[PDB]
Amino acid sequence: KIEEGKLVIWINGDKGYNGLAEVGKKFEKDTGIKVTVEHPDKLEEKFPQVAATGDGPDIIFWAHDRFGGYAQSGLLAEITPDKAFQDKLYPFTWDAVRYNGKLIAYPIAVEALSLIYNKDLLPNPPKTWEEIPALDKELKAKGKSALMFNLQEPYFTWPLIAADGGYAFKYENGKYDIKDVGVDNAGAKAGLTFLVDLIKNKHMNADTDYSIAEAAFNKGETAMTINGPWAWSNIDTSKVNYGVTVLPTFKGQPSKPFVGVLSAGINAASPNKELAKEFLENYLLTDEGLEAVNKDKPLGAVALKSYEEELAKDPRIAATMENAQKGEIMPNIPQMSAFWYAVRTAVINAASGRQTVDEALAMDGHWFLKLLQAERDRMEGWCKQMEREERENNLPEDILGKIRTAVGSAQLLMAQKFYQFRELCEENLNPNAHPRPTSQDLAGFWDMLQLSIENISMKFDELHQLKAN
Structure with missing residues (x-):
């Protein structure tokens, strides 16, 4: 039932939990307080389960999108960083950990899609979506493709769709308006229409999925793809000379990919809230703390200004952060499940022809x-x-x-x-x-x-x- 005088942290299996433990040892060396780092299965399912009964970890690391629901259920404590501490992280990341005007977690890392291109087929990646059809014809003459990405998941097509005005749910001071969904508007329409046309004009196939796209790019068959930091290691071994850059603009506006912010929330049931704060603010969220985690498992772009400035020396991280700042923070509420399901259907039906763009996006x-x-x-x-x-x-x-x-x-x-x-x-x-x-x-x-x-x-x-x- 959450022991007092120590800290127990839960973080996902695909994160740098060893480096986190490194920071943990250092905390114990200075304060004498032990820190335990665990990475159970389906912790995003377990946390609420055990947390509702006064149990669970003192700190939970997870994508910010699940925290709105947790806070709504009373599982997270309100954190209290001062003006000076908040000033150490990019403003936009604090917007991802707000529930009803209150801060419910510490932002750690930032993740968003970027345009990935084959430097050999395309040394100068296009700055606009509008110039892609023409680029594709030139590349098709050589048997290559201009662009290939997963058209099956809305997460991947959203950047284009939201570029000229689309958005999921309207955001206001840590609150999302479920009565205000931005899928049925002029901007979202123009975007899905451009995508639909690309498919019509033989520049893309409606059946292209994640694997097909990944395979095409890694085998040098397509000059570009749209993907996240999780795909970089696979490309590195493909030996394709690639680059990562800002997504193309549409109708002059930046593509707006969804942003995911890895965050650290304090269990509302934790009797160690002050220790957790100390650990998070002065041990983990420091260049040294994040560096240790990053060396174990890359965090991608981070929320801490001082360390990201350093990490951005790498153009790929620089690109990720650029795209993230132009993107849309993923709403941190459970109703996004409905959004994902609906938008997916809308795209699937619109691409084929089952429905027109207007019918597909109509609420x-x-x-x-x-x-x-x-x-x-x-x-x-x-x-x-x-x-x-x-x-x-x-x-x-x-x-x-x-x-x-x-x-x-x-x-x-x-x-x-x-x-x-x-x-x-x-x-x-x-x-x-x-x-x-x-x-x-x-x-x-x-x-x-x-x-x-x-x-x-x-x-x-x-x-x-x-x-x-």
């Missing part, structure tokens, strides 16, 4: 059904959490009333309104009226449903701001 029944599912999942999660506390502990009197009410309102809303909304959506999807709910009608109902979800969300926050008190 109809399909989108809302996916969003509703996402809301059901988080709310049911909160209820199980709270009824488990009432079921375990005693905490009689007041708190029980607050729990029953919070849970009661959520379950009714789901058993009643969620049920109705789901049917309205399926009707919207049926061409033969009833009357036929309009996309706008769905939007209106959804915006109303979100008002209710937010209120309930507040009561649960109200409860967490205590625990089982």
Whole structure:
């Protein structure tokens, strides 16, 4: 049940956990406090599980995108770095660890897609997407391809799609507006249209996946590809003389890839919050701390200004950071599951022809059904959490009333309104009226449903701001 007087850290298996342990030994040498570095399986699944029951590590390292949900569940403590410390990291990274105006984690590393090119086939990579079709024709005459990347996952096509105005969910002071999704707008349309055309004009195949693209580039068959730092080691052994640079612009605007920020959050149940802060602020987030982690497993670009300036001496890291600063921070909320599923479908259908670009990106029944599912999942999660506390502990009197009410309102809303909304959506999807709910009608109902979800969300926050008190 989280021991006091020490620190236990969880970090993923693909990170530099040995170097982290190195920093850990140094902390123990100066303070006498031991630091244990573990890397269990599916820790992103385990953390919330064990954390909800007062257990788990003092510190958890993980992509920032999962932390919004954790904070919403009351699993992370609010961190307290001062103005001087925050000034040591790039501003944009702090925006990735905010939940309802509060800081819930320390940014460590930054990751984003970049344009990777074969210096032998293309010494001067294109600066715009618009000049790629012409470049492809020139290369095709030589049997080569201009560009090949994974068109199956929205993560990979998003940069182009979001370039001229697209975005997932609107962001405001550590809060994402689920009623404001930026997939159905002029910019997102222009982007998917350019991509669609590339496929039509034989410049790309709708079936190109991650492996096909990786194979084509590593075998010198295509002058460029779009991929992340995780693919660099494979290219290094291919011996292809490559370079990494800023993604091409579209309609004059920067491509906007999603940004993932590896972060360190402090377990709300941790009795060692002050030790964790000391360790994170003065031992890990230092040139020496990050250097040790990086030598064990490259972190890519880092959030610490002083050390990134150093790491950026490497053009590839420089490119990653450049693309990351022009990108979109991945929303740190569970409803992104709906976004991923919908956008993927939209692209798949739009590329082939199953639907036009407008129909594909239109927010109809399909989108809302996916969003509703996402809301059901988080709310049911909160209820199980709270009824488990009432079921375990005693905490009689007041708190029980607050729990029953919070849970009661959520379950009714789901058993009643969620049920109705789901049917309205399926009707919207049926061409033969009833009357036929309009996309706008769905939007209106959804915006109303979100008002209710937010209120309930507040009561649960109200409860967490205590625990089982």
